[PDB]
Symmetry: D3
Subunit: 31 residues, 6 copies
């Protein structure tokens, strides 16, 4: 799954492996 | 999954969620 | 001390060395 | 530019390269 | 523009914003 | 002290709070 470090993002490729960019503008797991 | 950031460790609890302290003294995925 | 990177957690072992999982679900110093 | 990881700071040197300490005590891009 | 945190990768999307996955299997700045 | 995340550095200001740029070229505890 996605690391739980808070990282702001605008798109999914901004995030670490396993993550997508959530509607809150942070990297998160895609569940 | 363990995050793939390189983190030096002594013991498993030094590591982020999903990780253990591997043979080579870095955090990594179990086995 | 606990590094001042914001990381969400469920239990203490989710956090980096020096940190515990606070009642707000973020890593921090046991102080 | 400053990495978009949430990191608390009291002064710019607390942050990663490219970053300054913003008005709310987190690391961010200058200006 | 790539943060200088050492992160191992298999593909560019594994890396933070501004980074690509070098032939070295680490996140780094592109050309 | 300093987090044990590997961060490459040229100077101390490249590092997180409590850290300096050590002779190994990485941020560490002073
Ligand atoms: Na831990
Ligand atoms: Na710094
Ligand atoms: Na990415």
């Amino acid at each position: 799954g996605c690391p739980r470090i808070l990282i702001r993002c605008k798109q999914d490729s901004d995030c670490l492996a396993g993550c997508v960019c959530g509607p809150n503008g942070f990297c998160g797991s895609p569940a």
